[PDB]
Design a protein around this motif. Structure first.
Motif, PDB file in Angstrom:
ATOM      1  N   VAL A   1       0.852  -1.181   0.000  1.00 44.23           N
ATOM      2  CA  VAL A   1       0.000   0.000   0.000  1.00 44.23           C
ATOM      3  C   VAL A   1       0.888   1.231   0.000  1.00 44.23           C
ATOM      4  O   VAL A   1       1.762   1.376   0.862  1.00 44.23           O
ATOM      5  CB  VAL A   1      -0.949   0.017   1.208  1.00 44.23           C
ATOM      6  N   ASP A   2       0.666   2.111  -0.969  1.00 42.08           N
ATOM      7  CA  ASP A   2       1.315   3.412  -1.002  1.00 42.08           C
ATOM      8  C   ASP A   2       0.250   4.488  -1.151  1.00 42.08           C
ATOM      9  O   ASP A   2      -0.620   4.403  -2.032  1.00 42.08           O
ATOM     10  CB  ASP A   2       2.353   3.496  -2.128  1.00 42.08           C
ATOM     11  N   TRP A   3       0.300   5.473  -0.261  1.00 39.81           N
ATOM     12  CA  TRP A   3      -0.536   6.655  -0.350  1.00 39.81           C
ATOM     13  C   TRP A   3       0.213   7.749  -1.095  1.00 39.81           C
ATOM     14  O   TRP A   3       1.444   7.826  -1.055  1.00 39.81           O
ATOM     15  CB  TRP A   3      -0.936   7.151   1.040  1.00 39.81           C
ATOM     16  N   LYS A   4      -0.544   8.601  -1.774  1.00 36.68           N
ATOM     17  CA  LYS A   4       0.045   9.612  -2.636  1.00 36.68           C
ATOM     18  C   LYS A   4      -0.779  10.887  -2.551  1.00 36.68           C
ATOM     19  O   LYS A   4      -2.011  10.839  -2.545  1.00 36.68           O
ATOM     20  CB  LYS A   4       0.129   9.091  -4.075  1.00 36.68           C
ATOM     21  N   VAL A   5      -0.097  12.026  -2.454  1.00 37.54           N
ATOM     22  CA  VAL A   5      -0.757  13.324  -2.374  1.00 37.54           C
ATOM     23  C   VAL A   5      -0.092  14.261  -3.378  1.00 37.54           C
ATOM     24  O   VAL A   5       1.091  14.597  -3.235  1.00 37.54           O
ATOM     25  CB  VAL A   5      -0.735  13.911  -0.952  1.00 37.54           C
ATOM     26  N   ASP A   6      -0.844  14.660  -4.405  1.00 38.63           N
ATOM     27  CA  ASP A   6      -0.397  15.636  -5.402  1.00 38.63           C
ATOM     28  C   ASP A   6       0.935  15.231  -6.029  1.00 38.63           C
ATOM     29  O   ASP A   6       1.885  16.015  -6.097  1.00 38.63           O
ATOM     30  CB  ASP A   6      -0.310  17.033  -4.792  1.00 38.63           C
ATOM     31  N   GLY A   7       0.998  13.986  -6.498  1.00 38.81           N
ATOM     32  CA  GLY A   7       2.212  13.447  -7.073  1.00 38.81           C
ATOM     33  C   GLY A   7       3.267  13.024  -6.073  1.00 38.81           C
ATOM     34  O   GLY A   7       4.300  12.478  -6.484  1.00 38.81           O
ATOM     35  N   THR A   8       3.043  13.242  -4.775  1.00 33.98           N
ATOM     36  CA  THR A   8       4.054  12.985  -3.762  1.00 33.98           C
ATOM     37  C   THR A   8       3.617  11.858  -2.840  1.00 33.98           C
ATOM     38  O   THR A   8       2.502  11.903  -2.301  1.00 33.98           O
ATOM     39  CB  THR A   8       4.329  14.249  -2.940  1.00 33.98           C
ATOM     40  N   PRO A   9       4.457  10.844  -2.637  1.00 36.03           N
ATOM     41  CA  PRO A   9       4.094   9.757  -1.717  1.00 36.03           C
ATOM     42  C   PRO A   9       4.070  10.243  -0.276  1.00 36.03           C
ATOM     43  O   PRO A   9       4.842  11.123   0.115  1.00 36.03           O
ATOM     44  CB  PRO A   9       5.193   8.708  -1.937  1.00 36.03           C
ATOM     45  N   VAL A  10       3.178   9.655   0.513  1.00 35.26           N
ATOM     46  CA  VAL A  10       2.951  10.080   1.888  1.00 35.26           C
ATOM     47  C   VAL A  10       3.563   9.006   2.778  1.00 35.26           C
ATOM     48  O   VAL A  10       2.912   8.031   3.158  1.00 35.26           O
ATOM     49  CB  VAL A  10       1.470  10.292   2.178  1.00 35.26           C
ATOM     50  N   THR A  11       4.840   9.181   3.116  1.00 36.66           N
ATOM     51  CA  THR A  11       5.485   8.313   4.094  1.00 36.66           C
ATOM     52  C   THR A  11       5.057   8.646   5.522  1.00 36.66           C
ATOM     53  O   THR A  11       5.402   7.910   6.454  1.00 36.66           O
ATOM     54  CB  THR A  11       7.009   8.410   3.946  1.00 36.66           C
TER      55      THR A  11
END
Length: 210
Positions: free
Chosen positions: A149-159
């Motif tokens: 699972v990878d979350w992403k916000v405005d082209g940027t991954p959310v670590t």
């Protein structure tokens, strides 16, 4: 003080021969390391398979065998079955103590591969009053039981803010897992791009809201 390493995971079809192995950092594994092989199924007890390198515990099927391959210990499963899908740990004796390995997840294929069904649930109405925000990404009905699972916000991954559970088994013998995202309440309104990817067996499914 001595680390024991084994392969992270192995996958086979029902009836394939699998060779798990047990490695020692101090050097060659000998009979004086008294290799032990123990098995854990989900919702089952721990079951000892092999003691003393090759001495097999009474009552376990004929497919399980223990030996020494070169300088490291080994457990061979000849003709694996659908019930042998489990975690296998190895333990070595080091004069004064036993050291366990990291364990090997032996996966036997039991059904055709099913792609994960995924939902993305938004921050509830009451969440934003707490000056916080929770986004829920739900995953069910996939096989085998491994996703990323990878979350992403405005082209940027959310670590930051992720929390993913481990795959669990439901009644239909598939797998299930969840992933939570926890930011501030000003964040759910601030940004606009919130993307949830689920990568399963090489294929990426996505769900996203705005």
């Amino acid at each position: 003080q001595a680390v024991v390493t084994q392969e992270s995971a192995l996958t086979t079809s029902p009836g394939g021969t699998v060779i798990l192995t047990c490695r020692s950092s101090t050097g060659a594994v000998t009979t004086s390391n008294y290799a032990n092989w123990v098995q854990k199924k989900p919702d089952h007890l721990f079951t000892g398979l092999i003691g003393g390198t090759s001495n097999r515990v009474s009552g376990v099927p004929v497919r399980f065998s223990g030996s020494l391959i070169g300088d490291k210990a080994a457990l061979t499963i000849t003709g694996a079955q659908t019930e042998d899908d489990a975690m296998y740990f190895c333990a070595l004796w080091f004069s004064t103590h036993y050291v366990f390995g990291g364990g090997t997840k032996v996966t036997v294929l039991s059904q055709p591969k099913s792609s994960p069904s995924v939902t993305l649930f938004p921050p509830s109405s009451e969440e934003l009053e707490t000056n916080k925000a929770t986004l829920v990404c739900t995953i069910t009905d996939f096989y085998p039981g491994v996703v990323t699972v990878d979350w992403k916000v405005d082209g940027t991954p959310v670590t930051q803010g992720m929390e993913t559970t481990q795959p669990s088994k439901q009644s239909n013998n598939k797998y299930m897992a969840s992933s939570y995202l926890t930011l501030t309440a000003r964040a759910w309104e601030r940004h606009s791009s919130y993307s949830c990817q689920v990568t399963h067996e090489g294929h990426t499914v996505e769900k996203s809201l705005s």
